[PDB]
Design a protein around this nucleic acid. Structure first.
Lengths: 87, 88, 129
RNA sequence: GGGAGAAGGCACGCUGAUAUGUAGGUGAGGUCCCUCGCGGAUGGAGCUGAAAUCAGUCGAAGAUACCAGCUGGCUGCAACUGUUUAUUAAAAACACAGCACUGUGCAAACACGAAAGUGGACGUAUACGGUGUGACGCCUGCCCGGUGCCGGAAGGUUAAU
RNA sequence: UUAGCUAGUAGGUGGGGUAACGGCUCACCUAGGCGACGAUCCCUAGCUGGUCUGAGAGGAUGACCAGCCACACUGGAACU
RNA sequence: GGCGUAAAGCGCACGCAGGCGGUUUGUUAAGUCAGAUGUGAAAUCCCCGGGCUCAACCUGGGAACUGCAUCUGAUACUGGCAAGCUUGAGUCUCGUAGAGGGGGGUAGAAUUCCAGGUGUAGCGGUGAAAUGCGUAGAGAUCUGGAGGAAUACCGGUGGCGAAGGCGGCCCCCUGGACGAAGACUGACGCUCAGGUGCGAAAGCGUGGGGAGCAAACAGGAUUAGAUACCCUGGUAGUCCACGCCGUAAACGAUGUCGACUUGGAGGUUGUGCCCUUGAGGCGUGGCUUCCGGAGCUAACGCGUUAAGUCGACCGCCUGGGGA
RNA sequence: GAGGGCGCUUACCACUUUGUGAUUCAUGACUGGGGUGAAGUCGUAACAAGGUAACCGUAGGGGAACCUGCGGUUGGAUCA
RNA sequence: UUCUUCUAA
């Protein structure tokens, strides 16, 4: 913290990354349904969370949670994702 | 080690006063003759563990006692390392 | 070892307040007297007694008020590793001006409120409060 | 250290100029010294003579003939130079420096010799003989029951006597 | 976890060249030049006034307006 | 902002560039400060206005544009330049203590082994045993000899070295520290990226040596199992010579060099005075241990050897796993 | 007469080609660990003296935690 | 001397 050390080396402010990189700084991105299925969550909760494996515009293959209760989703379907993790 | 009469001669060698003993010229020449007396002790002993550390102490202790007489006075620095046979 | 007599001085003032001593002595300097002749004038010490011929020694008298001390704070602004040169407009106000800031300008040593009225800035030594 | 001439690519004749012989090499007649010689300096005539540049110029092509490496990538095996089936087999075979074991105190061990004697060796354990392994790197586990070897001398067995 | 980089390179002299000065170009000398104050190499990028946030310090940012720069199918070259 | 334990001070030492600098006098005016010119486009923002019915918006004036250049100063400080001074720093002089270092000897017990005398039936080991060793005479006991390794007691919350660390005695070479009176030197200083050296143990390489001990390993127990703990063995290894490695909870989990700041009880090592009136008293140093005030600390604690108060410079830290 | 034209050739250079490297992305039979489990199997190492105190180095061994040797640390309990 | 283990609210 001596200023000579501060002269020889600047304060490296830490660089943070996105947790949602597949959108690549976009609000929403178009996607293609690849597999629609359910998934059991981790220990404190017990459900069958409806979820779909998605091929995106940029070739990314991601999973994205189906909100709500009940849907009409097929594979090979055009959807749109907004973000947000599921805990 | 360097004896009293030998130190007294080196004082009387470079004596500005014959009593001065703050002449680094004397003092350089003292550790000069001291460790030249010790070069037969450390070409002999190279496993002198802490005597070799004393050699190192006298490796640096002669060295930095040169290092103000390094930066001491160009008219006299030129004259002294000529007489002392110093390489640099 | 000896990197500053000034930071030596202010700390000897600082540690003497808490030690409740009446007399803090040290070897004197020309710049030391030029500061010590301000704080008597500014009313933070009582007496300084510069004495010594081979080597001048400044002996101070600490000002105590109602039992406790007067010097509530004593700092160093321009340290020897980092100097401070502020203009006449960037002169500070120690404790909203209630304390004083010792600045040395080309017109010797004075306080900041005098230096504002002198209208010329310089090197800020320390903060006294 | 190498691999590596890795690979790959460019130049190549002749004529003229540079410089009608250049760089260089050799080196007189001169000149001086000289203890004067089968001299020393100086001195450069002479001869001899590369290499390069520049500019021309000929062919389809100028290292023109003769002469004179095909290169690359992976892997087996042996480290290598070596040695060999004279006369169908040249290697992965052998040898090898290296490693390990073992024997041996000099009148050595051992070998050739009925013997004498000789090699060992005019060497003396950092020596010599034998066996196995075969550079270098990293290493080298378990089993003595068996077979050998070594050590033991209590007892059993037992020759000539 | 980019440390060495450079041969017209770096300097000179001379010639040439351009509106202009200068390896601008060429010839001939010299061996210099550069770099740990980051050369070199790689990645990303038009730049600034400004904009946004922040009490400030700062941080991020360059649509719109400006000032500059660069580009015009691509790669090239001159012409006028 | 922090680095004693919540992440974090390199294992230390050396040292260049580097950054940093006692004191005093002049000089210089570089930095610095002040003033003045130039420029810092407009827009924007700010301030004061105006205009659109207001507002948004438009717009007038102002300030601002934190700068840079130039010129004129200023001289306290920081530099630059000279000269000094001696407190810092360093010599000289006498001594002091020490497991400080290498080199070479030399002891004495112990253990092992070998050989012999005496002698007899067990020995050894464990919680019990057993493996093992014994009638081929062990064990035990005495005598003789050999070998390697370590040096009882002293010995100590001792000593020395920067640490890593250093332990019989003697000799040779060699280092560091401290104190005492002095004499001198003239700031000769600090820290130090990169660099350089040292650097426990185990491990590596050649050689050597090998008593004891002991990974691995072997047997015996043990247990449900026992690749362990226990026993009986036993090899590298431990020792030496020369090199490599460069890590340790290399810890005081506190980087180095200054200065200030209540104490008490010690240890060790100097050195004055007082009659040593005994193993005494009054001093004055060096080093170190415990306690503990202020203060600090998240608390715990530290606490003049600071984790108090400040200085200089370096190293480092930035949720956990991944690592 | 000069000059110009055209062609000639020379200089430079785009397109393009050869080889060799380098760098980066994608992919890759197979293989290395890592992290994660609302129920498995095996043992029970650490936390108390965790039932052989614990841990650092380093070496060896071993299905697995681990074990053991050497050295160090206390960030360990015990005391006619 | 020996002696181990207790799933998921």
């Amino acid at each position: 913290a001596t200023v000579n050390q501060l002269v020889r080396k600047p304060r490296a402010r830490k660089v943070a990354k996105s947790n949602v990189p597949a959108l690549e700084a976009c609000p929403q991105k178009r996607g293609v349904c690849t597999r629609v299925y359910t998934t059991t969550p981790k220990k404190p909760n017990s459900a069958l969370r409806k979820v779909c494996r998605v091929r995106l515009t940029n070739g990314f293959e991601v999973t994205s949670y189906i909100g709500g209760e009940g849907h009409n989703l097929q594979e090979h379907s055009v959807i749109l994702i907004r973000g947000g993790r599921v805990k | 080690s360097l004896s009293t009469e030998a130190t007294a001669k080196i004082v009387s060698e470079f004596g500005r006063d014959a009593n001065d003993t703050g002449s680094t010229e004397v003092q350089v020449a003292l550790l000069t003759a001291q460790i030249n007396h010790l070069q037969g002790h450390f070409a002999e002993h190279k496993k002198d563990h802490h005597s070799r550390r004393g050699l190192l102490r006298m490796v640096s202790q002669r060295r930095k006692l040169l290092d103000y007489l390094k930066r001491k006075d160009v008219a006299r620095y030129t004259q002294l390392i000529e007489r002392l046979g110093l390489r640099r | 070892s000896m990197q500053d007599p000034i930071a030596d001085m202010l700390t000897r003032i600082r540690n003497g307040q808490a030690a409740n001593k009446a007399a803090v002595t040290m070897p004197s300097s020309k710049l030391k007297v030029a500061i010590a002749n301000v704080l008597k004038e500014e009313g933070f010490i009582e007496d300084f007694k510069v004495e010594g011929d081979t080597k001048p020694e400044l002996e101070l008298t600490l000002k105590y008020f109602q039992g406790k001390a007067v010097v509530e704070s004593i700092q160093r602004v321009s340290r020897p590793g980092l100097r401070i040169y502020k203009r006449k407009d960037e002169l500070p106000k120690v404790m909203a001006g209630l304390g004083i800031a010792v600045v040395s300008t080309s017109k010797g040593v004075m306080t900041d409120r005098a230096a504002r009225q002198a209208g010329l800035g310089g090197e800020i030594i320390c903060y006294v409060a």
